[PDB]
Amino acid sequence: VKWPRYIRLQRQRAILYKRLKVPPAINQFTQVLDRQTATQLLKLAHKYRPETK
Amino acid sequence: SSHKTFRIKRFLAKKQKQNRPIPQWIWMKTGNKIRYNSKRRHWRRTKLGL
Amino acid sequence: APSRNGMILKPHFHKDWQRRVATWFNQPARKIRRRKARQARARRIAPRPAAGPIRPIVRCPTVRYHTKVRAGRGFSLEELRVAGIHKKVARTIGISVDPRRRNKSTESLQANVQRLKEYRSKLVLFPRKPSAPKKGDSSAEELKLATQLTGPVMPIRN
């Protein structure tokens, strides 16, 4: 498909983060704790949610 | 030109009614300076623009 | 083609000067307009000093003029904090302040502090509400004897 320019722009940006030699200060955000740890973190953090309106 | 457009015929219709002379009771008025219609237009002499 | 003898001279009329000429035929019109505006301001601030706030003793700079004493911009805040007048209240009661001025000396600072105290002894502060007086305030019988002075408040003599 001849995609629109914003779709082609964001997909090529996602490809450039794979091509380019990404510095470690930006590479460090790729390593995220796994989904068995994230559910534990969010079940603890759901207790202490701030009050709403 | 017998193929006139409407705005040109509209223009000619006004320039034809402006060619009428003064009414002869105008020079009976008190503060009048006008002897005759001075902006008259003869169709040989001045060709109206357009 | 200069003649026999005289100054050879440089008139600056080589530009187009007749287009940019300032004729002063509204000179007496402005000398009426300014004094009408000044009378209106002096009526508008009704007991207050007509010249404006009080402005300090200053020395001129620059060797030609340092023997003389001028009126300055405003009382320095070092000269205010040792006179006891707060930096915000001074401009309310009629004391010009500028924070930019230093004080290199001690004689000038003591002269301006003495000038502020001699001013504060002379102002007649009216109550902020006319019925009930307060503590930082002048007496009732002194309120009838107030008037606008003309010219600069405590004019600077050399």
Binding site: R5, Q12, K21, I26 | - | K15, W17, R20, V21, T23, W24
Partner: protein, 203 residues
């Protein structure tokens, strides 16, 4: 606070982290069009320094000006006149590319009012700038007494009288001994006060 950290972060532009970020943003902004609305600033600290507050009514554009000097817009060579004014291609424009970037968005949005502007990226052939604008008829600024000064009709098109921070810096404007030729309002007001005759009445 985080703004001191990201200010000192954006100061280190020659570093590899910010160099990677500048070239990725410059690729993206070069692919995208000439004058489009950014939804939020790329420099949230610098926008706050220049005047932006994240409330309803402030609008950020990133625009690109085409980089380079200014050759003389004249047919082929042929600037007719004396050999002083024979210069064509090494001429430089009086205002800056950031001021041109302000006035292009200020002309593209005539309803809004250019507050200020800043730098996001560059390459060999473009400069990019985020000019931040204020919608002067929104009630979140016409009811705010410290930003309703821009809703007054005096400040229509600050970018084209040259009253912004980057439009100001080409006026020769400032205090000092360096700026004698603009005392008065401008370098035209200075010239006009100097080149008149005050022919008095009496003389």
């Amino acid at each position: 606070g985080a703004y001191k950290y990201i200010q000192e972060l954006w100061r280190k532009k020659q570093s590899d982290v910010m160099r990677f970020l500048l070239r990725v943003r410059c690729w993206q902004y070069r692919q995208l069009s000439a004058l489009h609305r950014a939804p939020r600033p790329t420099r949230p600290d610098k926008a706050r320094r220049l005047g932006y507050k994240a409330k309803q009514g402030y609008v950020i554009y990133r625009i690109r000006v085409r980089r380079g000097g200014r050759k003389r817009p004249v047919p082929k060579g042929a600037t007719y006149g004396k050999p002083v004014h024979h210069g064509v291609n090494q001429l430089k424009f009086a205002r800056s590319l950031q001021s041109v970037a302000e006035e292009r968005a200020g002309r593209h949005c005539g309803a809004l009012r250019v507050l200020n502007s800043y730098w996001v990226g560059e390459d060999s052939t473009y400069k990019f700038f985020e000019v931040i604008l204020i919608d002067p008829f929104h009630k979140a600024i016409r009811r705010n007494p410290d930003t309703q000064w821009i809703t007054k009709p005096v400040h229509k098109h600050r970018e084209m009288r040259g009253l912004t921070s980057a439009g100001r810096k080409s006026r020769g404007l400032g205090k000092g001994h360096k700026f004698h030729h603009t005392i008065g309002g401008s370098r035209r007001a200075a010239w006009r006060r100097r080149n008149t005759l005050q022919l008095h009445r009496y003389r």
